[PDB]
């Protein structure tokens, strides 16, 4: 019988790097939201306001999302 193999995509690599990064719970949720909105070419497809809305918490400013995004942008591949 055939079952197939699991292939690693760009988002899988990004989430693997996120899980091995010393983030907090809120920072990890923001990182998950950011990695979700990444296309095949590696560009962010949504504005940060949409990510902030998707977080669903009213105690987070745009600055924390900016910091998390800057940390993510230094993953492999760079850029």
């Amino acid at each position: 019988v055939y079952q197939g193999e699991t292939t690693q995509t760009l988002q899988d690599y990004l989430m693997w790097q996120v899980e091995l990064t010393p983030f907090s719970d809120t920072d990890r949720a923001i990182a998950t939201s950011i990695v979700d909105a990444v296309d095949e070419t590696g560009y962010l497809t949504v504005p940060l306001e949409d990510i902030l809305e998707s977080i669903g918490d009213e105690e987070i400013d745009i600055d924390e999302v900016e910091a998390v995004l800057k940390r993510i942008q230094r993953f492999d591949p760079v850029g």
């Binding site: 079952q3 197939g4 193999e5 699991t6 292939t7 899980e19 091995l20 560009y43």
Partner: protein, 1327 residues
């Protein structure tokens, strides 16, 4: 008299028994079988003719038209074997069959010939066998293995009381046709005969008899002897035959002529029978009680009433006797059914049988064959006729008919292919006779009951299988009336026949990739006999008896060459001198002994014929005239061996090596080895890998040359001549004028195979072994293939070995190897791997092989040429790009971001992906060959044009050589004609070669035109494109070559079953050394010798030491220049050693140059040949050691390399032949931390090709449970295999230095729950 190849290096032979029969061609069983299938036969059997005649003529139901077969022809193959292997196609020939369609008329007697149309049609491609007995299916060589199956005929067997609880034997008989249905007869514990058709529900044995139109009276007459009751007006006076009463007890008063020979209660003895015979006592009075159980034979009806008084086969009673007596009857017929000899089985079977007619039996047969449908008379009759009496559904072949007649003790051998009434009656009679006690059952394992089927017969069967389907299609399509226009070309289609042939030659169980480790592997594979396959046995249902060695295997099947494991006893190997009959039975040759002297005439005897004679053993001493010396010769007579007289001998064996196979005949001192270790050595000898340089065994048996030559790995001169040109890749031989064909330039060109990949990813390379200008003869070796040295098989290396323990580094089969062996590259091997890149056609444009990969850097493209292909000779490793390919991605809408990207970085980077071919991780090597296949109509790149130019150059070179030889001859004739006139002494020399003469000029022009035509044809053949596949544009194949060195973990072995693994590579100064400071190469543990009982290795070591001593003497004499006289005197002394050997080497017929060449070839040791059962004795070995100034015992004193002190005991030091097996640690080591998983089970994959993990099976779980390690088992079960969240959490914790886990739930349990729920069962977890 020795040939040129053999005269260079003569191997001393210790054999003493003269040879009377040469070793035959080792690949005859394939070539003859395929020739029988292919060649034209005037008779109607043995090949395609038989298949065509067994189907044609094909006639329709209306009978107004039919197809007639005339003849067939095989066309020339398009490509040669080398071309087929290079391209990757099938080496095959087209089949053209000349069919003929006739048209019959109506309302006329018979069939009026209205019209006849004959046409040649194409029936497909038939694969052809090469000169070496192989088939090229898809650029790869394949071997079809012969099958050992059960012969057709009739066989009588029984169950050894196992079926019944009382231990009663129930005999049975089985009729097996070659094509049809089987027929079984069997008994029961109640002694009733029963019949069985196609292994179905049991039926009474009289059902078939009644279906064959036989009445009860006729059956009783056939199966019983009549006894005549004569009513002589008083008490049924009886005519008595004395022999009828043997072994019986009289139940009445027997008196005759007033004398009571036997009284009441007295049993009849032999003396009483003798007295009755002497007196010829006939008339006997019997009482009415004697007929209380006698059974009447026929039917008797009262003349008055006219009705049936009693039916046939029923016991008479007193009332019935009175009724028949009062009806005016005097003659009665009964059956003799004594309980000792003539057992009454048929009568009881008739009693059990319900049917009493001819139609109800057919109805019951039809009901049993096809249940659940109403019976029909016509359907039952048709089924009964087609079961056994139709030529189109039942066939008893010639071998089957011969076996049937021989089993029935008939005289005629030929006959019909269908059963008859007489055959069934005789089978029943023989079974009844066996039941009575006069007969013997058959042995299924006897080689006279087992038959050999080769490739030709299977190909014929598959061709017939296709042809019957073609005939069915023709019958289906011939019903329509269009006879005025249609042609036979469109009447038939060749697709089914070609499909069947290709399926047989490509996907059959007996069609396998040829084992190509060494020539011995190929020879063994081509001579393999298998009991498995379609129509054979299964390894799970075989049993012990079929796997045993039978006496009839003597001289036909090797008893010490079979795989160990599930296939033991089921895969066999042919013997050296074994052949097959015209019926396919194995036979072996013998010398006939006439008038007490062993003659020279050779008779091939089969298993059946062998048992009737007394055959003397090969190891029997004779005289110069051929007389046995011992008066009690050991001989085999009837499957057992015993002592016989000199005058009772009928035959003798022809050789001492006819009982073993080719592989077992290459083991020196085989008679000193145990059978299990001999089997292990034979199995290991054919998996050795060739090394960089071949090395002859230096201790052999004499069979190396036969194996090397009969295997097609070497280049053999087809005709004699002189070496005109020699090179590392080609040899040109100038043929002698006495072997040249008229009107031909006599030259033979041999293009050598250089560094090609085999089926096992090894290296195939040929090296010349001839010099420029030396003479050659037909059959001489010109080039040596892999594992070949001067035309001799060379599988391993000669190593200096000592038998002693060394600090535990040879503990339990471990091997210690010196560093000098590694430094000299004696066991370094070459391995070649192939990679393929395919460019196809997509919907968004085609994929392109190109050098412009936009995302990668400049350096990564440094080893690619202008066409995007790696250079030849580049050193590559894991991740390097071999072929650059891009896959187009297409979108017709350009977003502003995409427009910005195109503007900044160019449009080429966009709308393109990367799908280049890259070297897999862990793979390295050098690019040695690149091949490009392009579809027809597609433009070729630069690389393909270069390859085509390279291919054209060689053809141009060969044609130019032949053309220039012919031109030289023609210009010589021109000069001979021209100087006959103006005798221009210097004008011709000064003038160029332009120069009856007109006829020669015309011949020159015609020769140039013909050679231009040949060159154009070769260019067209080279330029021809390929038909790859639907949607495939181009294919690029790249070959990488790597060299593997020896290292710890590699498997080494000898020829006596002594295998081991290298444990340490020791520096040179640590190895033991002798008084001269010479270290040993390998140290072997002596403790493995006594328990295994393989003593042949010690004798081989001693003999190799002696040979090396002789070689050292020769080399010492060579280093200091001495005259040829002393060298030849010493060599003559060396060759004359031995106790009455059969080899005579006279160096007086050698020239000085030949003697010097022989000495140069003998300066590294003198090779020695010892047959398997005619080898050298210990005294001869000691004499040879004395000749070399070496100790007789074969043991010297050694010193420790680390301390310099002497070992306390002498150590056996010598030379042994060692092999490197194809079990390399480089292919064994594998490790994994994390990787890919299955999509369904989410568990790690298996294998080394993927980054797979090791399986933790049930037994390991049991072992962990027995320890009590619950946490280890739990982490094995969840966080390591199939807990998706647990794997990530465990990895994160490990990276953070926290060695803790959250177990979770396995995913396979959820998969199981879903699968069970899909069956309509509600299974769930609760609480």
């Amino acid at each position: 008299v020795y040939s040129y190849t053999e005269k260079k290096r003569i191997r001393k032979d210790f054999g003493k028994r003269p040879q009377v029969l040469d070793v035959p061609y080792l690949l005859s069983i394939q070539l003859d079988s395929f020739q029988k299938f292919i060649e034209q036969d005037p008779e109607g059997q043995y090949g395609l003719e038989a298949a065509f005649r067994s189907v044609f003529p094909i006639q329709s139901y209306s009978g107004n038209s039919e197809l007639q077969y005339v003849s067939y022809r095989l066309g020339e193959p398009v490509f040669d074997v080398q071309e087929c292997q290079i391209r990757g196609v099938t080496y095959s020939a087209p089949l053209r069959v000349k069919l003929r369609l006739v048209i019959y008329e109506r309302e006329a007697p018979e069939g009026t010939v209205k019209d006849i149309k004959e046409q040649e049609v194409y029936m497909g491609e038939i694969p052809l066998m090469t000169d070496n007995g192989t088939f090229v299916i898809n650029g790869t060589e394949r071997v079809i293995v012969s099958q050992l199956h059960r012969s057709p005929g009739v066989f009588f067997d029984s169950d050894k009381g196992k079926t019944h609880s009382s231990g009663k034997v129930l005999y049975n008989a089985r009729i097996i046709p070659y094509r049809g249905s089987w027929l079984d007869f069997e008994f029961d514990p109640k002694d009733n005969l029963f019949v069985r058709i196609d292994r179905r529900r049991k039926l009474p044995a009289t059902i078939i008899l009644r279906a064959l139109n036989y009445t009860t009276e006729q059956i009783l007459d056939l199966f019983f002897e009549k006894v005549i009751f004569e009513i002589r007006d008083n008490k049924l006076q009886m005519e008595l035959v004395p022999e009828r009463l043997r072994g019986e007890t009289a139940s009445f008063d027997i008196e005759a002529n007033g004398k009571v020979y036997v009284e009441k209660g007295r049993r009849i003895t032999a003396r009483h029978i003798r007295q009755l015979e002497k007196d010829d006592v006939k008339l006997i009075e019997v009482p009415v009680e004697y007929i209380a159980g006698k059974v009447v034979a026929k039917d008797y009806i009262d003349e008055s009433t006219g009705e049936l008084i009693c039916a046939a086969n029923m016991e008479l009673s007193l009332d019935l006797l009175a009724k028949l007596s009062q009806s005016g009857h005097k003659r009665i017929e009964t059956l003799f059914t004594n309980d000792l000899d003539h057992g009454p089985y048929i009568s009881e079977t008739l009693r059990v049988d319900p049917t009493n007619d001819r139609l109800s039996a057919l109805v019951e047969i039809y009901r049993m064959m096809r249940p659940g449908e109403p019976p029909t008379r016509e359907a039952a009759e048709s089924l009964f006729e087609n079961l056994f009496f139709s030529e189109d559904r039942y066939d008893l072949s010639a071998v089957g008919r011969m076996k049937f007649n021989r089993s029935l003790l008939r005289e005629e051998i030929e006959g019909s292919g269908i059963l008859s009434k007489d055959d069934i009656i005789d089978v029943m009679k023989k079974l009844i006779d066996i039941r009575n006690g006069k007969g013997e059952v058959d042995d299924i394992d006897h080689l006279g009951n087992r038959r050999i089927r080769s490739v030709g017969e299977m190909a014929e069967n598959q061709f017939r299988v296709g042809l019957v389907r073609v005939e069915r299609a023709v019958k289906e399509r011939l019903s329509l009336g269009d006879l005025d226009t249609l042609m036979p070309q469109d009447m038939i289609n060749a697709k089914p026949i070609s499909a069947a042939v290709k399926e047989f030659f490509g996907s059959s169980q007996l069609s396998q990739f040829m084992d190509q480790n060494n020539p011995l592997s190929e020879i063994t594979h081509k001579r393999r006999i298998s009991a498995l396959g379609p129509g054979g046995l299964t390894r799970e249902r075989a049993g012990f008896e079929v796997r045993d060695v039978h006496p009839t295997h003597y001289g036909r099947v090797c008893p010490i060459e079979t795989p160990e494991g599930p296939n033991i006893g089921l895969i066999n190997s042919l013997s050296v001198y074994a052949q097959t009959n015209e019926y396919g039975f194995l036979e072996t040759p013998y010398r006939k002994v006439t008038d007490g002297v062993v003659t020279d005439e050779i008779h091939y005897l089969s298993a059946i014929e062998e048992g009737n004679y007394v055959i003397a053993q090969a190891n029997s001493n004779l005289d110069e005239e051929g007389h046995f010396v011992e008066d009690l010769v050991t001989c085999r007579s009837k499957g057992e061996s015993s002592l016989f007289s000199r005058d009772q001998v009928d035959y003798m064996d022809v050789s001492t090596q006819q009982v073993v196979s080719v592989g077992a005949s290459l083991i020196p001192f085989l008679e000193h080895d145990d059978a299990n270790r001999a089997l292990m050595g034979a199995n290991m000898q054919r998996q050795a890998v060739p090394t960089l340089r071949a090395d002859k065994p230096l201790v052999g048996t004499g069979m190396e040359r036969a194996v090397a030559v009969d295997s097609g790995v070497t280049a053999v001169a087809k005709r004699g001549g002189v070496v005109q040109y020699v090179d590392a890749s080609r040899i040109v031989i100038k043929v002698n004028e006495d072997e040249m064909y008229p009107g031909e330039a006599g030259i033979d060109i041999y293009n050598l195979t250089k560094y090609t990949r085999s089926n096992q990813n090894t290296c195939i390379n040929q090296m010349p072994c001839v010099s420029l200008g030396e003479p050659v003869e037909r059959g001489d070796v010109l080039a040596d293939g892999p594992s070949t040295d001067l035309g001799e098989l060379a599988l391993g290396q000669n190593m200096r070995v000592a038998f002693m323990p060394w600090n535990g580094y040879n503990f339990e089969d471990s091997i210690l190897v010196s560093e000098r062996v590694v430094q000299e590259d004696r066991f370094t091997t070459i391995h070649i791997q192939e990679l393929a890149c395919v460019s196809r056609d997509t919907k968004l444009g085609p994929e392109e092989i190109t050098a412009d990969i936009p995302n990668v850097g400049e350096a990564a493209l440094s080893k690619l040429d202008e066409s995007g292909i790696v250079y030849i000779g580049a050193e590559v490793t894991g991740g390097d790009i071999l072929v650059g390919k891009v896959t187009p991605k297409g979108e017709t809408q350009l977003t502003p971001e995409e427009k910005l990207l195109r503007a900044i970085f160019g449009e080429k980077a966009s709308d393109v992906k990367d799908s280049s071919l890259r070297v897999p991780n862990g793979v390295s090597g050098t690019v040695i060959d690149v091949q490009v296949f392009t579809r027809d109509g597609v433009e070729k790149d630069k690389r393909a044009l270069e390859i085509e130019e390279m291919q054209l150059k060689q053809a141009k070179k060969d044609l130019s050589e032949e053309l220039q030889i012919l031109e030289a001859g023609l210009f010589s004739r021109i000069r001979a004609v021209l100087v006959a006139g103006g005798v221009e002494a210097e004008k011709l020399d000064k003038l160029p070669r332009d120069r009856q003469l007109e006829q020669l000029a015309e011949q020159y022009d015609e020769l140039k035109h013909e050679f231009e035509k040949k060159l154009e044809a070769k260019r067209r053949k080279i330029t021809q494109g390929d038909d790859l596949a639907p949607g495939v544009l181009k294919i690029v194949k790249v070959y990488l070559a790597v060299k593997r060195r020896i290292q710890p973990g590699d498997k080494m072995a000898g020829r006596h079953g002594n295998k081991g693994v290298i444990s340490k590579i020791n520096p040179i100064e640590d190895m033991p050394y002798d008084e001269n400071g010479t270290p040993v190469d390998i140290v072997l543990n002596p403790l493995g010798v006594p328990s295994r009982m393989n003593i042949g290795q010690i004798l081989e070591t001693h003999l190799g030491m002696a040979a090396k001593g002789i070689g050292d003497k020769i080399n010492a004499m060579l280093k200091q220049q001495q005259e040829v006289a002393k060298l030849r005197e010493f060599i003559q002394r060396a060759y004359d050693l031995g106790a009455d050997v059969r080899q005579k080497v006279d160096l007086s017929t050698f020239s000085d140059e030949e003697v010097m060449r022989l000495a140069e070839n003998l300066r590294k040791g003198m090779p020695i040949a010892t047959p398997v059962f005619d080898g050298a004795k210990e005294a001869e070995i000691k004499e040879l050691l004395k000749l070399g100034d070496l100790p007789t015992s074969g043991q010297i004193r050694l010193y420790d390399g680390r301390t310099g002190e002497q070992f306390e005991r002498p150590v056996t030091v010598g030379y042994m032949y060692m092999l490197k097996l194809n079990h390399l640690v480089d292919d064994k080591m594998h490790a994994r931390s994390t990787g890919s998983y299955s999509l369904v089970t989410q568990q790690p994959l298996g294998g080394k090709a993927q980054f797979g993990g090791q399986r933790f099976g049930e037994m390991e779980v049991w072992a962990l449970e027995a320890y009590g390690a619950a946490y280890t088992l739990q982490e094995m079960l969840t966080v390591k295999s199939d807990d998706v969240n647990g794997r990530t959490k465990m990895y994160k914790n490990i990276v953070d230095g926290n060695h803790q886990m959250e177990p979770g739930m396995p995913e396979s349990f959820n998969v199981l729950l879903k699968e069970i729920r899909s069956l309509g069962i509600n299974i769930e977890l609760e609480d």
